[PDB]
RNA sequence: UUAUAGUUUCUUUACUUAUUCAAUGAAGCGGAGCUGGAAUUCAUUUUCCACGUUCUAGCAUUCAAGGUCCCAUUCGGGGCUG
RNA sequence: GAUCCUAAGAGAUGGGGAAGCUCCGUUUCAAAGGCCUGAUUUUAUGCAGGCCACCAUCGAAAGGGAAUCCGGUUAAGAUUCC
């Protein structure tokens, strides 16, 4: 299962890989709306651990709250 | 590749197929009957001595019409019911909060003939 | 001819209101088009880590063509072909009572991510095709490194759509040939050697080297001007 | 809106848009400058032809 | 204590500009291809008044290079500009009064006006009556030209920043006394609601930091700090000095 | 002593791509090529050197000229230049 | 007269703020529908001549504004009834 390799990789957030991906995705998300939709989960292993399934009815929604 | 010429510096929403509504079930399925029919339009006549003076003299019929009734619908109602050609219809709403209409007929029909036909004198 | 006279147009500054020419470079594109482009450019401009950059080197279009020609066979059973095979099997469960010996062993392509990951971990895979355009790359960033460590021959092939069309899905993000017919083992062996030349062998070197850090064409031309300034004076 | 064109338009060039003095003054302006643009055309063409034909006296 | 006149001016309810009787936004026509590479000719179609502003506006009809129109633009008439005369806007345009050329494409010592701070601004500096910039210096190396502003301050603007040649018309407007209150009243009535100013000292101490006392007096220093909070500034903000000087300012 | 290029360790500059401020109804941006007229080292594979509108309160909008295939040569509509 | 238009302005929309009641802004960092000619006569539907676009709505019974006058008439209406 790729899900274990995803779960392990996603924890190392300052690994050269996730550093790059954080920088490019945070740009993609900031350019879209505040509360916009998501065609699929960005983290399909995190989603399904919280109870997401890949059947009709389940949705994902990306949302950005101001910090501070 | 070889992407199409665009003389416009603006992109606008491409036109797409506005599809017609085709419901699986009728909304009501039994349509309503005519709300204001002839008899709902023309409710009563007005038997006040002033209304009678105008019926005898002017060749006019003072009829108590509904609210939500067009001058067109009063003309059409009087013609269909009483069998008479209406020259004009002048409508005011009374201080009583009911409508009344001065149905003047063409020269062909004397209003007394149709007043006596209805019953009231 | 005798009554029609040739004229200048004269599209200078003043004369002749400019003609409706191509403004396809200057179109105020929708924000979704503007964003999918600006993301593609920005992903190249920033320094790409060497484990992400290894997906830029996709398999060339003749080795790919031959890989897909072998992978065209062992296509997973269709909905019709499945139904008919089940009708023969389930009928033979009554007529003869000979089940699980009828319907001869299937040679199909193995696909789905969590399936093939486990086939590589158990070292049953003989060729693994890894897509280069998976929506969250992280799903696949680990797969060449796992595939090498286990010592399965793997190739980064162009198109998850192309893989999807091969497995009767829309996208597959991964494919794997774990078995083969005796006839077609020779082709697999050759194509495995030619893809090992590109990906497997060079993994240890490509592991070191970064992608991206590439300027836009206007800043490229400016640097080439500012470099010819000092040295090429 | 329901009046004849006669009532609100004199039969001339611009008629019910400009005066008879304003229209004649822009006729004389239009034609004159069209003849000073055709004399410019040749004066500049002969200043080109002069500079071309006499430039090659020097390289010799 | 109350919120001071000064404090509640910025809320902008009644204190907003009286903007009905005005012609429009007085700008230079946008920095475009024709102005960059050549110049466009425009005709001063009419020279009009503008309320709350003591300098005539030159409505100058230009053409549209791309479609069949006459894009009319509202300028601030330089002095000596007249009706029907041709204004020339661009890099290659000649150095005559009314013409709009970038400061880089101009010699030193020129008297320019309606200058851009940034290139593509469409006018910012020397826009008021009888005022102008003097282009002091230049530098094509890091193309930025030195200019002297009506305040007497030296700035450094880009060489692509445009400006109209000559002084802005209506000069000497301030040198006549306004006269008897009503003249001021009528002047202000078409700009803003900043007129007959009450003295903070003549108010009660609620209303202003100057109020109160059995005599009208400020009581403490009128020179207030720059770091004084939005509500405390009444008198002279960050006063480098005070008093009437001797000889020259 | 420095000759590995294995981190900013601190300070002097630079790069765009994040961030930022504008403007346009996102038209002409950047590089190169023509024509330059020429640079003279000498007519060039060498590098400096512009790119259709100005006396005048007019006008400038529906692709015209050449060229090429179709319209069986009616009607014209189309390729590339311009 | 109202109905229509816009004025100082009030205000949805896109969006962005706010724990939220809702606040900002009204042309904005939006893919923001309408106009006409015949078509072709498939119990009337597919064309194209093609064009055109910084864009709700509310806001005046004194501002802008399509068009009525005379005579007579009733206990009480009339620039309306005759």
Curated annotation (Swiss-Prot), chain A:
Superkingdom: Eukaryota
Localization in the cell: Cytoplasm
Regions crossing the membrane: none
Family as reported in the entry's similarity comment: Belongs to the eukaryotic ribosomal protein eL15 family.
Assembly and binders: Component of the large ribosomal subunit (LSU). Mature yeast ribosomes consist of a small (40S) and a large (60S) subunit. The 40S small subunit contains 1 molecule of ribosomal RNA (18S rRNA) and 33 different proteins (encoded by 57 genes). The large 60S subunit contains 3 rRNA molecules (25S, 5.8S and 5S rRNA) and 46 different proteins (encoded by 81 genes).
Note: There are 2 genes for eL15 in yeast.
Main function: Component of the ribosome, a large ribonucleoprotein complex responsible for the synthesis of proteins in the cell. The small ribosomal subunit (SSU) binds messenger RNAs (mRNAs) and translates the encoded message by selecting cognate aminoacyl-transfer RNA (tRNA) molecules. The large subunit (LSU) contains the ribosomal catalytic site termed the peptidyl transferase center (PTC), which catalyzes the formation of peptide bonds, thereby polymerizing the amino acids delivered by tRNAs into a polypeptide chain.
Name of this chain's protein: Large ribosomal subunit protein eL15A
Natural source organism: Saccharomyces cerevisiae (strain ATCC 204508 / S288c)
Gene name tied to this protein: RPL15A
UniProtKB/Swiss-Prot annotation, chain B:
One of the GO biological process terms: cytoplasmic translation
GO cellular component: cytosol; cytosolic large ribosomal subunit; preribosome, large subunit precursor
Function per UniProt: Component of the ribosome, a large ribonucleoprotein complex responsible for the synthesis of proteins in the cell. The small ribosomal subunit (SSU) binds messenger RNAs (mRNAs) and translates the encoded message by selecting cognate aminoacyl-transfer RNA (tRNA) molecules. The large subunit (LSU) contains the ribosomal catalytic site termed the peptidyl transferase center (PTC), which catalyzes the formation of peptide bonds, thereby polymerizing the amino acids delivered by tRNAs into a polypeptide chain.
Entry keywords, A to Z: Cytoplasm, Isopeptide bond, Ribonucleoprotein, Ribosomal protein, RNA-binding, rRNA-binding, Ubl conjugation
UniProt-recorded name of the protein: Large ribosomal subunit protein uL23
Subunit structure of this chain's protein: Component of the large ribosomal subunit (LSU). Mature yeast ribosomes consist of a small (40S) and a large (60S) subunit. The 40S small subunit contains 1 molecule of ribosomal RNA (18S rRNA) and 33 different proteins (encoded by 57 genes). The large 60S subunit contains 3 rRNA molecules (25S, 5.8S and 5S rRNA) and 46 different proteins (encoded by 81 genes). uL23 is associated with the polypeptide exit tunnel.
Any Pfam family matching the protein: Ribosomal_L23
Molecular-function annotations in GO: RNA binding; rRNA binding; structural constituent of ribosome
UniProtKB/Swiss-Prot annotation, chain D:
Annotated GO biological process: cytoplasmic translation; ribosome biogenesis
Keywords assigned by UniProt, alphabetized: Cytoplasm, Ribonucleoprotein, Ribosomal protein
A GO molecular function held by the record: structural constituent of ribosome
Disulfide pairings: none
Organism superkingdom: Eukaryota
Subcellular location: Cytoplasm
Chief place of localization: cytoplasm
Subunit organization: Component of the large ribosomal subunit (LSU). Mature yeast ribosomes consist of a small (40S) and a large (60S) subunit. The 40S small subunit contains 1 molecule of ribosomal RNA (18S rRNA) and 33 different proteins (encoded by 57 genes). The large 60S subunit contains 3 rRNA molecules (25S, 5.8S and 5S rRNA) and 46 different proteins (encoded by 81 genes).
Additional information: Present with 23600 molecules/cell in log phase SD medium.
Family: Belongs to the eukaryotic ribosomal protein eL34 family.
Function: Component of the ribosome, a large ribonucleoprotein complex responsible for the synthesis of proteins in the cell. The small ribosomal subunit (SSU) binds messenger RNAs (mRNAs) and translates the encoded message by selecting cognate aminoacyl-transfer RNA (tRNA) molecules. The large subunit (LSU) contains the ribosomal catalytic site termed the peptidyl transferase center (PTC), which catalyzes the formation of peptide bonds, thereby polymerizing the amino acids delivered by tRNAs into a polypeptide chain.
UniProt protein name: Large ribosomal subunit protein eL34A
Native source species: Saccharomyces cerevisiae (strain ATCC 204508 / S288c)
From Swiss-Prot, chain E:
Per UniProt, location of the Glycyl lysine isopeptide (Lys-Gly) (interchain with G-Cter in ubiquitin) cross-link in this chain: 45, 92, 118, 144
One of the record's GO cellular component terms: cytosolic large ribosomal subunit
Modified residues (Phosphoserine): 51, 94, 158-159, 248
Principal place of residence: cytoplasm
Gene3D superfamilies: 2.30.30.30, Nucleic acid-binding proteins, Ribosomal protein L2, domain 3
Alphabetized InterPro entries for the sequence: NA-bd_OB-fold, Rib_uL2_dom2, Ribosomal_uL2, Ribosomal_uL2_C, Ribosomal_uL2_CS, Ribosomal_uL2_dom3, Ribosomal_uL2_RNA-bd_dom, Translation_prot_SH3-like_sf
RNA-binding keyword on record: yes
Gene Ontology biological process: cytoplasmic translation; maintenance of translational fidelity; ribosomal large subunit biogenesis
Quaternary structure (record): Component of the large ribosomal subunit (LSU). Mature yeast ribosomes consist of a small (40S) and a large (60S) subunit. The 40S small subunit contains 1 molecule of ribosomal RNA (18S rRNA) and 33 different proteins (encoded by 57 genes). The large 60S subunit contains 3 rRNA molecules (25S, 5.8S and 5S rRNA) and 46 different proteins (encoded by 81 genes).
Note: There are 2 genes for uL2 in yeast.
Protein name: Large ribosomal subunit protein uL2A
Organism: Saccharomyces cerevisiae (strain ATCC 204508 / S288c)
Organism lineage: Eukaryota, Fungi, Dikarya, Ascomycota, Saccharomycotina
